[PDB]
Curated annotation (Swiss-Prot), chain B:
It comes from the Viruses. Pfam families: Rota_Capsid_VP6. The VP6 trimer contains a zinc ion located at the center of the molecule. The zinc ion is not essential for either trimerization or transcription activity of the DLP. Zinc-depleted VP6 has an increased sensitivity to proteases. Ca(2+) binds at N266, D286. Its main location: virion. This is Intermediate capsid protein VP6. Intermediate capsid protein that self assembles to form an icosahedral capsid with a T=13 symmetry, which consists of 230 trimers of VP6, with channels at each of its five-fold vertices. This capsid constitutes the middle concentric layer of the viral mature particle. The innermost VP2 capsid and the intermediate VP6 capsid remain intact following cell entry to protect the dsRNA from degradation and to prevent unfavorable antiviral responses in the host cell during all the replication cycle of the virus.
Swiss-Prot record, chain E:
This is Outer capsid glycoprotein VP7. Glycans are attached at N15. N-glycosylated. The N-terminus is blocked possibly by pyroglutamic acid. The chain holds residues 55 to 326 of 326 of the full protein. Residues 199-201 are annotated as: GPR motif. GO terms for biological process: receptor-mediated virion attachment to host cell. Some rotavirus strains are neuraminidase-sensitive and require sialic acid to attach to the cell surface. Some rotavirus strains are integrin-dependent. Some rotavirus strains depend on ganglioside for their entry into the host cell. Hsp70 also seems to be involved in the entry of some strains. In group A rotaviruses, VP7 defines the G serotype. It comes from Rotavirus A (strain RVA/Monkey/United States/RRV/1975/G3P5B[3]) (RV-A).
């Protein structure tokens, strides 16, 4: 859990820079945020 | 900044020297300096705070001098001095706490915490008493460019790096050649490992070399070099490069033969130690090259011959280690140690008053990511905050 | 994507353990069992293959990834074993009369050999290092060797009278010959029936797993008589039936695939 | 004195070593040997039990703490072995034709099992982990098992035509059956002469000590063909008589009881 | 290894690896029975070895492996050596056979087997072909549509299929890439495998002992390449041929290069 507490949006896994990896892994779920309506833009 | 150090030094010497019963012949000069400070201060309004949880305090200085009428001191003098000193003291502490939490990539040396800017003027220059401290002496020097140096005990110049390098590998990780290393703080524990014990190599010898490139030069370093690195010398289950699979490591230690430790500078060698263990010196060095070997024992008793067969299984893995601790050193730049608390003061002030990350220092001021990229901006800002932290710790430890 | 080079690798100790590759390699790979005709005989069921495939289906392997490949006898399998899969399991019966044969089979399939050809008629060969051996296959091999001295003459044998030679093999389907490394040898071999290759032993083949269904561990993979090792992919079992053996394999296949690792070559 | 509960137990590394439990455990404990009829036959004596007891008395074991319990055969012993003593020792002959039976015996006595009952005619059962086996005792057990698919139908067998089932036991007195863990098996057993129990293997039984009197250590306690362990209380002797075996047991009794530990249950 | 390489241009050329690759490698000639017959000698192999021994190749490094004919060789060529030279004659009837032999040995293939009676296969890219070996492979193909029905063929009547190969020991079939085909094959004699072409096999070297350069390695009729290890000689005897080979072997081995992929005794990789 890269964060305050455990959040499924912030659970890095399947890692086959550390911060770069964490950011990419967290960004691979914002594609789901997009079709989950928690966005603001285009 | 020099006037701030002078404020702190004279307030300290006032809290110390100006005590009941003492003699005016010991505090005449300090009383004149205190009175001059009060004169040069009276008539100015300072503001401190406005970032994070720091509260916006206002300082208005209207104080009175000290009458040079006595020979010995009495409580009616000491109490006046103390009720004039506590105000200046908490003022300096709040100034320092407002100055440690500010950053800038553009002229970091140039002051922040605008009360301190106001103090950097020319109407305040009559407050200077003595710039005796190491940090402030080096500050004055660097301003009037000269060869400086901070003396460090067990400096934390190495960022934490624990990692391996495999020059011979397979998916099964059954016959490996490589080197593991842990560079932490002041210590380097390096260890080369061959699973064949150099049966296939020329003259039954396998080389290993570790190259550590510091970010800042050091000088007059005293170093303790020993064999048999302790943390890479017991069984282990290590991860692959890609973090998917794992592999086992059952080490058996041997001694480094033809060991060679070279302290270099700009690629030119400076110091070279061949087969000397224990305490050694390095007059100037930016790069360290530790080059050792694993030499198969030509004569083996049965107990050890049973561990190094001529076939691939290799259930015991020959290793060769080296521990290197930098005990003392002297650096033209500022770092952390195991002796001084300035870094702790700074990080504690920030973690207490909840400062947003600035454009220079990384989040939480993690020394690892702060010394991995020791940019000149970071160096200047770290020097400034360490200096004012020293100035604050001279009053409130 | 460089090939045919060895470059330094790097890593760290802060990386986290990734999710498991089992249940993905089980789909993107293949499994191949080798069983003896005795098992199919004792069983007498024409659907045991589909039964075992449907059982593997629970353990993860899909239906068209598992293969069963029969073999009449240890020697008839040792004759040119062409293993081409991603995870190979071999079942092997214990027979004191076949100790060396089924140890040579292990030393052949478990290890990875770099094999050049041999011209008995013309050349007189020698072994350079402790890992260059001469492996011969065929229906029945009869090998006879004669060492030579410094001046190309025999040592206890005559270069013309073949009978004087020393007999290392007698009617064997597979032979692995290690001779004194550093002296030129002449050979006589019935090349009509058998082919002999000069091979060099390399790192192990992590793709095959031998399972001795019977008596005590006798397999000496390494030819030096000091190691006598027992490896991870060298298993033993006690048996009175075969359905129980195959159920054991199916229930502990994940352990087998954990003890095995896909090839590097 | 809390039972049925597990708490932390603290300690330290400055404590000293207490007086030896030996020479008092020997007094307050009991030792039970399990020898074969072959030994009494080759001996042909009626006072040898008293002889060995008076010998043990020199090692400290009193005369009434030592018990002997003959067993006519490994199979008749595997039939409900009721080991109720504070230190059990067993002497086991070697027979390649009984390798798996005398390995199942070891896997049954060396280990501690939690055995729930089974009702074959009513229910269809499955395993859950690698330690949930089916142990069947009796005079002659003939077991057959048909796996089932998701829709409760047979896989290479018919739920009614019992002869299509797969026979994994043929008249064995003790059977340890491990099958695929994750499918429902329908069983056919001769429940008139054999009792079957769904038994889960807990931590081992430290109160027993097997001594293979003959050949190489073959016993594969653990089903999975990757461990092939050899515990501390699994010993081996080479023999030509039995008096030497018993004198050796006596002379090295202390080491045996050091290798054995009283039960935790 | 997916990691990158680096280098420089100021580094100097190292010494010659020739005169050591001979000592630590092997060579293998593949000649036709016609040569031995024309020669009518028994120690010509020892002669060539004692000749090679001057050019550097030691005694126990050279090998000569006979093949009765081009097709007999084409059926499962077992090349396992560190350097392979092949001498192949010219015959306008065997033109395509000895072009397919080239396409097979010169190049490295990754082969998966095929189950025809139970499945129906297709091609994907321009390098996935079907190679069939054996005594006589008589292949017929019927393309299908999305709904498993014939195009210009009837799935039942084998005699309506399109016969691409009639009594050929080695066939390399390329069909339209994208459609599903049904195949009729003489499985009792031939085995047919779906093989993807990898990079070239730099371990072999073909020598056309006769007529003009006709080998079309690449099946597309636009490239018609002429690779480095594809030589041509004109002959009236075989002794002159072997003497030419021996005298110009260093150039042959300079045009060849030891493999990179892996060790394997077959002429194609098998990965199920
Ligand atoms: C591995 O398990 C974790 C935890 O359940 C999960 O987040 C992750 O997605 C898994 N890996 C894959 C490849 O699904
Ligand atoms: C145990 O033996 C030691 C060593 O002789 C002795 O000091 C101690 O008193 C003994 N303990 C008892 C309970 O007798
Ligand atoms: C390369 O050739 C030069 C010239 O003959 C020689 O001096 C040198 O030693 C050679 N290199 C080696 C590694 O022997
Ligand atoms: Ca043999
Ligand atoms: Ca002789
Ligand atoms: Ca040898
Ligand atoms: Ca039994
Ligand atoms: Ca089970
Ligand atoms: Ca059946
Ligand atoms: Ca053809
Ligand atoms: Ca047609
Ligand atoms: Ca095509």
């Amino acid at each position: 859990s890269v964060g305050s507490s455990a959040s499924a949006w912030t659970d890095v896994s399947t890692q086959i820079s550390s911060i770069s990896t964490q950011t990419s892994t967290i960004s691979r779920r914002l594609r789901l945020k997009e079709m989950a309506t928690q966005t603001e833009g285009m | 900044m020099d006037v701030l150090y002078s404020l702190s030094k004279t307030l300290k010497d006032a809290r110390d020297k100006i005590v009941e019963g003492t003699l005016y012949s010991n505090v005449s000069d300090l009383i004149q300096q205190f009175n001059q400070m009060i004169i040069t201060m009276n008539g100015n309004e300072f503001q401190t705070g406005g970032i994070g949880n720091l509260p916006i305090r206002n300082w208005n200085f209207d104080f009175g001098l000290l009458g040079t009428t006595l020979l010995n001191l009495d409580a009616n003098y000491v109490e006046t001095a103390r009720n004039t000193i506590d105000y200046f003291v908490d003022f300096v502490d709040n100034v320092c706490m407002d100055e440690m939490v500010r950053e800038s990539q553009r002229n970091g040396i140039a002051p922040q915490s605008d009360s301190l800017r106001k103090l950097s003027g020319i109407k305040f220059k009559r407050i200077n008493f003595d710039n005796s401290s190491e940090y402030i002496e080096n500050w004055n020097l660097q301003n009037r460019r000269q060869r400086t140096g901070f003396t460090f005990h067990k400096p934390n110049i190495f960022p934490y790096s624990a990692s391996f390098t495999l020059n011979r590998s397979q998916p099964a990780h059954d016959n490996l050649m490589g080197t593991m290393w842990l560079n932490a703080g002041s210590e380097i524990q390096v260890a080369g490992f061959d699973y064949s014990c150099a049966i296939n190599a020329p003259a039954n010898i396998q080389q290993f070399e570790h190259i550590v490139q510091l970010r800042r030069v050091l000088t007059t370093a005293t170093i303790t070099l020993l064999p048999d690195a302790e943390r890479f010398s017991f069984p282990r289950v290590i991860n692959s490069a890609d973090g998917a699979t794992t592999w086992y490591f059952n080490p058996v230690i041997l001694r480094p033969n033809n060991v060679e430790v070279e302290f270099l500078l700009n690629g030119q060698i400076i110091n070279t130690y061949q087969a000397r263990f224990g305490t050694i010196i390095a007059r100037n060095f930016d790069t360290i090259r530790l080059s050792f070997q694993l030499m198969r024992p030509p004569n083996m008793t049965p107990a050890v011959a049973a561990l190094f067969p001529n076939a691939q299984p290799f259930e015991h893995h020959a290793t060769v280690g080296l521990t290197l601790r930098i005990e003392s050193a002297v650096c033209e730049s500022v770092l952390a140690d195991a002796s001084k608390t300035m870094l702790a003061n700074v990080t504690s002030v920030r973690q207490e008053y909840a400062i947003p990350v600035g454009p220079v220092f990384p989040p939480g001021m993690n020394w690892t990511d702060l010394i991995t990229n020791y940019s000149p901006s970071r160096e200047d800002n770290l020097q400034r905050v360490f200096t004012v932290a020293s100035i604050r710790s001279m009053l409130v430890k | 994507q460089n090939y045919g080079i060895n470059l330094p690798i790097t890593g760290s100790m802060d990386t986290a353990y990734a999710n498991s590759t089992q249940e993905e390699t089980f789909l993107t790979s293949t499994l191949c069992l080798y069983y003896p005709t005795e098992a199919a005989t004792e069983i007498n069921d024409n659907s045991w293959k589909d039964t075992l495939s449907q059982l593997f289906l629970t353990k993860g392997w899909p239906t068209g990834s598992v293969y069963f490949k029969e073999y009449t006898d240890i020697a008839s399998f040792s004759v040119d074993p062409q293993l081409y899969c991603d995870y190979n399991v071999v079942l092997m019966k214990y027979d004191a009369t076949l100790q060396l044969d089924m140890s040579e089979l292990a030393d052949l399939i478990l290890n990875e050999w770099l094999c050049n050809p041999m011209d008995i008629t013309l050349y007189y060969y020698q072994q350079t290092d402790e890992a260059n051996k001469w492996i011969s296959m065929g229906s029945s091999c009869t090998i006879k060797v004669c060492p030579l001295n410094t001046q190309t003459l025999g040592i206890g044998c005559l270069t013309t009278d073949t009978a004087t030679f020393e007999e290392v093999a007698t009617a064997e389907k597979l032979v692995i010959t290690d001779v004194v490394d550093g002296v030129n040898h002449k050979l006589d071999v019935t090349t009509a029936t058998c082919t002999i290759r000069n091979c060099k032993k390399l790192g192990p083949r992590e793709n095959v797993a031998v399972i001795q269904v019977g008596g005590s561990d006798v397999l000496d993979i390494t030819a030096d008589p000091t190691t006598a090792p027992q490896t991870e992919r060298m298993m033993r079992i006690n048996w009175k039936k075969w359905w129980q053996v195959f159920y054991t394999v199916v229930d502990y296949v994940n352990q087998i695939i954990q003890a095995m690792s896909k090839r590097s070559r």
